[PDB]
Amino acid sequence: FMVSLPRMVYPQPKVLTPCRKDVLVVTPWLAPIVWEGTFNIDILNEQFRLQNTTIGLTVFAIKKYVAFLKLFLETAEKHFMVGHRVHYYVFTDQPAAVPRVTLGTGRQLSVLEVERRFLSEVDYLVCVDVDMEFRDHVGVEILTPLFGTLHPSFYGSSREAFTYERRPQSQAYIPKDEGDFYYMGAFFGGSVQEVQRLTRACHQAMMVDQANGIEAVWHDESHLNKYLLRHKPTKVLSPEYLWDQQLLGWPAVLRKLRFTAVP
Ligand SMILES: CC(=O)N[C@@H]1[C@@H](O)[C@H](O[C@@H]2O[C@H](CO)[C@H](O)[C@H](O)[C@H]2O[C@@H]2O[C@@H](C)[C@@H](O)[C@@H](O)[C@@H]2O)[C@@H](CO)O[C@H]1O
Ligand SMILES: [Cl-]
Ligand SMILES: [Cl-]
Ligand SMILES: [Hg+2]
Numbered sequence: 670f671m672v673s674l675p676r677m678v679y680p681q682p683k684v685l686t687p688c689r690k691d692v693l694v695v696t697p698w699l700a701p702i703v704w705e706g707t708f709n710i711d712i713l714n715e716q717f718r719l720q721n722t723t724i725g726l727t728v729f730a731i732k733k734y735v736a737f738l739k740l741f742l743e744t745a746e747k748h749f750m751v752g753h754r755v756h757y758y759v760f761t762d763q764p765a766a767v768p769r770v771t772l773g774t775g776r777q778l779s780v781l782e783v784e785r786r787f788l789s790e791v792d793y794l795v796c797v798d799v800d801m802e803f804r805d806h807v808g809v810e811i812l813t814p815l816f817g818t819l820h821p822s823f824y825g826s827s828r829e830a831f832t833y834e835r836r837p838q839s840q841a842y843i844p845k846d847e848g849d850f851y852y853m854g855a856f857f858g859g860s861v862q863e864v865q866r867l868t869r870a871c872h873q874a875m876m877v878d879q880a881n882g883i884e885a886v887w888h889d890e891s892h893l894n895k896y897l898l899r900h901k902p903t904k905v906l907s908p909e910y911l912w913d914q915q916l917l918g919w920p921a922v923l924r925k926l927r928f929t930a931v932p
């Protein structure tokens with residue numbers, strides 16, 4: 670059950686005026702592709718707040734990677750789901766090395782040393798790499814049952830150029846005539862149920878490959894791509910959500926650089 674939205678004053682959407690004319694904003698299976706200009710964040714914030722939505726953000730920081738946690742968490746505090754309930758889950762082999770970062774109200778962090786718990790603690794799970802920093806808004810516009818993010822190096826590439834696993838001996842195998850997009854393994858998520866289904870499927874596929882003496886060209890990312898090819902994501906995030914400015918610059922098609930690699 671969803672309560673009604675309150676009176677809101679905003680620009681009327683124009684049916685005969687497309688959002689963006691420079692990019693694809695909806696997939697062939699009718700899943701929105703999230704670009705700046707396609708969403709009114711005020712409307713979306715209202716919808717998700719009325720549901721008291723809690724977002725879990727998971728990150729793994731092992732060995733030398735624990736050094737990236739401070740900037741990651743500090744910038745997430747400024748740009749990630751601000752205004753909503755957030756629960757950070759930091760998986761690390763060095764619990765005492767996790768930096769003491771000041772969090773806004775309604776936000777918490779749990780350190781897990783290296784999950785039915787996720788089902789009872791959050792509504793959505795967002796899985797990202799730690800050697801990154803948020804530079805702009807990353808909010809509820811990304812929430813949906815299952816989402817993948819367009820890899821910044823292949824969004825304008827033809828499918829045959831995609832670096833999918835091409836060996837039929839692997840469970841992640843995808844032939845040259847198949848494939849929608851090349852998703853980057855560094856940023857995916859969805860409802861807890863859908864994320865666990867995906868991780869469970871990939872874990873099993875990787876075990877099968879191991880028993881067969883084969884390892885996918887791009888490991889987890891290869892399996893993620895195979896999974897999203899067979900189970901279409903309900904939203905696809907544009908490269909605004911996973912960029913590397915040092916390597917790729919700043920093309921006009923990107924009005925915002927929201928989550929980027931750390932040089
Ligand atoms: C068009 C082309 O092939 N460009 C190269 C990229 O594919 C490389 O990025 C790497 O891509 C593979 C999958 O093919 C995988 O996703 C790697 O994680 C990814 O490298 C990461 O992401 C990049 C955007 C950079 O931020 C890099 O520092 C990360 O480690 C890149 C980097 O090897 O080279 C292009 O030539
Ligand atoms: Cl994950
Ligand atoms: Cl992850
Ligand atoms: Hg628009």
Ligand SMILES: [Hg+2]
Nearest residue numbers: 727794795796
């Ligand atoms: Hg996760």
Ligand SMILES: [Hg+2]
Nearest residue numbers: 727728796797
């Ligand atoms: Hg993760």
Ligand SMILES: [Hg+2]
Nearest residue numbers: 870871892896
């Ligand atoms: Hg998979």
Ligand SMILES: [Hg+2]
Nearest residue numbers: 871872875889
């Ligand atoms: Hg896996």
Ligand SMILES: [Hg+2]
Nearest residue numbers: 871889892893
């Ligand atoms: Hg995966």
